[PDB]
Nucleic acid binder design. Structure first.
Lengths: 271, 88, 55, 129, 100
RNA sequence: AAGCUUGAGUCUCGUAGAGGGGGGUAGAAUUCCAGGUGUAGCGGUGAAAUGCGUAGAGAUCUGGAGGAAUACCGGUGGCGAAGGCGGCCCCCUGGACGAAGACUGACGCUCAGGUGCGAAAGCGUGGGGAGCAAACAGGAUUAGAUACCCUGGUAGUCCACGCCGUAAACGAUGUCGACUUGGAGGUUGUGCCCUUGAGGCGUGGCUUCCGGAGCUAACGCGUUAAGUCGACCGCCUGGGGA
RNA sequence: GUUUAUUAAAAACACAGCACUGUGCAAACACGAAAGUGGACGUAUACGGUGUGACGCCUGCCCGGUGCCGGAAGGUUAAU
């Protein structure tokens, strides 16, 4: 759900956050935790690499699995908790001999069901099998499109992948980005959707609410000193020339894809 | 839509000498049994104003038949609304 | 209403033009043309009859 | 739906007389058979008969003599929502004395004559000529 | 208990798998205290026009006399299997025993 | 207060329906996508012209994507509180209606303010985009054309829902009950004659057209009455202004 | 809230939210004469570029020029 704050003091009325009464809490599982450290855009080799970054309150990384290697063993969901690294939230899983793993949340917000993987697996969430099994026209979840990179796509809150068509050794997938791609039917999929799906509804309401996440204020190129951005300070409200990067180059509408190695797998292109 | 087999569990308890099924004490129970069944029914589903008006018709008749029973004998009224859910 | 799954019977009531034989031509009452239209729809949604015509 | 047994009593007679019918029938009540007994005594009808084990129904016979209807006015006057009450000298002279009125009274249904003779008044029920 | 004929369109080239589906569909009827009347084939038949590139189907029918409360958890079991497809449940109208 | 039922109600075995809700579930062309075969035509009007087309159009095929609505029967017809609603198939469900009986015992009729509904269009958050098309840009046409008519085309139409509450919401007839000339016809139960039944004799529910006594200024209403009469509610006293 | 140490303090600046543009991820992008790292152990409910300025009601026309995209058939045309 989403909930809105009362006007107790100025501006606070705008604040809207995601709340879930079934969402659990506790301590992270230490063998799948690392402190990960802040990067701050300040550079090991010289001058800064990134912009609009500074400060932010302490965070750690919970290590999530997209390899799903323990085949033919039933595992149980133990708890679903708030995650600081991805908006989908992350669940804790216990395997039948004692191993514990963190997984991308299946839909249902619930724990206690048992899941398997193979060439054939139950129709339920969290169970994984190859897309060659299914008659298409459905949701496939996170998909192992390239074995050497694990389960790809649809990792953020409420994200989804539609399987559109099939023939022989291949199938086609359509994405909420505007791109459509072709893959081998033998590629592993977990089926269904990602949970949460409310993260885009959040309204910060306050000018400090991104500051505690390390987000630095944005100063305009046409307002800062003429040597410190290619646009340069006014000359009030008169931008002058065509928009460019801080590095002096035109960008608007100019396509920058140069990959050339995966375009044969893209059957309909993002506009 | 309530079976002769479901009424067999109402007219058995709310009766007294048989046949009593025309009496207010038994018809308020038969209306309550239909109201409480057609209450759910709803959830899942909501968007059906026809069966919603059917429910409110059965409630409209029950409100009147309760008021009428109370207007004949208060003790026979109070000894019914401890066996059917009313006023919490 | 009766025997509507038999296509060797039903093809006596539908045309090469991809249409229906009029009740004026079969000599039948108005509600037989309804019984025939229901037989056609009940054969379509049972894989006994095609939905459409053309080559 | 139905509130007053007299609100469908006299319509039957006024409409049946217009249809040229010799008898008119109605559902029976205490006041309907009390009015009929006085309308026979004053000669406005020939006879009346009442029968029924499921519902008692009352049939009265109309006068036409040799063809022309004998009752030249048939009116109600008074209704339960707005009743008319007349005192011992305020009792009416219907059709300027060519007709009569019927009253209920404390002594039971009678003519405006019988009421004025009894030196009393009461509530109106019928007007006739 | 309520009548249903339950007639399958088994795939004309994949009927070599079908006994494993049947043994899981019959289980849902016996568990529910239903009563199977025939469980018999009509065999391979032609279709009226070609659908999903197929012009044939392999026909098998149950006649189950089953509890009415099972239907919405039964009609889904032959809906995503893609080797037993295009099933009709055919409610009421009684059951023929033991016949083809 | 005491007593009733033949006012009102519910029901045994049973009846039709494009009513609602949830599920599904199926087909076609303008379109889009990758090409072939192939040459200068296509498109369109009362006339024409922008425009589509030699980058190979239009059309004709192969293999494929996308969106909406549900052809036929369909009407003399049903249902729904109205507004509205037609597919087949599987659930969930309101109301009405018949046969042959019975148990209560005035429990009825109406209703301010409430308590709940929505056709098109509109507002919100996220998707959606074949066809139709406000706006818009052209072709024109013309004295002018800001429009008709022709070429393109976004919003809007669809869906998750959440809002909005208005209509020529119209047979312009408030709700409720009784009494009473019909004909023709549709639609759905049903009593009876070995239905030995195709037939015949009846009888409830719903309802269309033609119209008679009555009503009405007139047209119409006309047993489903604007009639005959009663209970209650909602309204109202000239346009131009408003 | 931010705004320059000892004459120039606010209407300028930032902010909640708004739009456009590049990005299918070994992203695009950046720093590093690089080894490498940051982008991010984030994956389209996610990141890079530029403007707007909470909240409520809101958004006309012009593609000649200068940029960018779709088409590459035709023209212009270089080293070769």
């Amino acid at each position: 759900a989403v909930v809105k704050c009362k006007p107790t003091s100025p501006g606070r009325r705008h604040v809207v956050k995601v709340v879930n009464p079934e969402l659990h809490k506790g301590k992270p599982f230490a063998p799948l935790l690392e402190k990960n450290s802040k990067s701050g855009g300040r550079n090991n080799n010289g001058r800064i690499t990134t912009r609009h970054i500074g400060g932010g309150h302490k965070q750690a990384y919970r290590i999530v699995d997209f390899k799903r290697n323990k085949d033919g063993i039933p595992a149980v969901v133990e708890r679903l908790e708030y995650d600081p690294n991805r908006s989908a939230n992350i669940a804790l899983v216990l395997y039948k001999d004692g191993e514990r793993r963190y997984i991308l949340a299946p839909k249902g917000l619930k724990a206690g069901d048992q899941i398997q993987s193979g060439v054939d697996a139950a129709i339920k969430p969290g169970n994984t099998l190859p897309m060659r099994n299914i008659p298409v026209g459905s949701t496939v979840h996170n998909v192992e499109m390239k074995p050497g990179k694990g389960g790809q796509l649809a990792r953020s809150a409420g994200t989804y992948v539609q399987i559109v068509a099939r023939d022989g050794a291949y199938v086609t997938l359509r994405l909420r980005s505007g791109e459509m791609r072709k893959v081998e039917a033998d590629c592993r999929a977990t089926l269904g959707e990602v949970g949460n799906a409310e993260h885009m509804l959040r309204v910060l309401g306050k000018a400090g609410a991104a500051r505690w996440r390390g987000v630095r204020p944005t100063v305009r190129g046409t307002a800062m000193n003429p040597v410190d951005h290619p646009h340069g300070g006014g000359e009030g409200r008169n931008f002058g020339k065509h928009p460019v990067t801080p590095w002096g180059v035109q960008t608007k509408g100019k396509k920058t894809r140069s990959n050339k190695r995966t375009d044969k797998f893209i059957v309909r292109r993002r506009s | 839509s309530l079976s002769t087999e479901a009424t067999a569990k109402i007219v058995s308890e709310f009766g007294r000498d048989a046949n009593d099924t025309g009496s207010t004490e038994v018809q308020v129970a038969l209306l309550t049994a239909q109201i409480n069944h057609l209450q759910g029914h709803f959830a899942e589903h909501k968007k059906d104003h026809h069966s919603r008006r059917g429910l409110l018709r059965m409630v409209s008749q029950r409100r009147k038949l309760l008021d009428y029973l109370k207007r004949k004998d208060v003790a026979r009224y109070t000894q019914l609304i401890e066996r059917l859910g009313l006023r919490r | 209403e009766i025997d509507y799954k038999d296509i060797a019977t039903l093809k006596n009531y539908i045309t090469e033009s991809g249409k229906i034989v009029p009740s004026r031509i079969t000599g039948t009452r108005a509600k037989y043309q309804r019984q025939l239209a229901r037989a056609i729809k009940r054969a379509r949604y049972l894989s006994l009859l095609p939905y459409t015509d053309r080559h | 739906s139905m509130q007053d047994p007299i609100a469908d009593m006299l319509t039957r007679i006024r409409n049946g007389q217009a249809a040229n019918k010799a008898a008119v029938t109605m559902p029976s009540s205490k006041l309907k058979v009390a009015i009929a007994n006085v309308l026979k005594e004053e000669g406005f009808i020939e006879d009346f008969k009442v029968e029924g084990d499921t519902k008692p129904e009352l049939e009265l016979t109309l006068k036409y003599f040799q063809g022309k209807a004998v009752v030249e006015s048939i009116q109600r006057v008074s209704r339960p929502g707005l009743r008319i009450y007349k005192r011992k000298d305020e009792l009416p002279k219907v059709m300027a004395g060519l007709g009569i009125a019927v009253v209920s009274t404390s002594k039971g249904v009678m003519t405006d004559r019988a009421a004025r003779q009894a030196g009393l008044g009461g509530e109106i029920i019928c007007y006739v000529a | 208990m309520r009548h249903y004929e339950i007639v399958f369109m088994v795939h004309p080239d994949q009927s070599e798998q079908v006994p494993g589906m049947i043994e899981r569909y019959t289980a849902a009827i016996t568990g529910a205290e239903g009563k199977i009347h025939r469980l018999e084939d009509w065999g391979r038949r032609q279709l009226a026009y070609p659908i999903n590139k197929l012009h044939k189907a392999h026909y098998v029918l149950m006649n189950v006399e089953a509890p009415q409360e099972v239907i919405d958890e039964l009609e889904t079991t032959f809906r995503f299997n893609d080797a037993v497809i295009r099933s009709m449940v055919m409610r009421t109208k009684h059951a023929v025993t033991e016949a083809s």
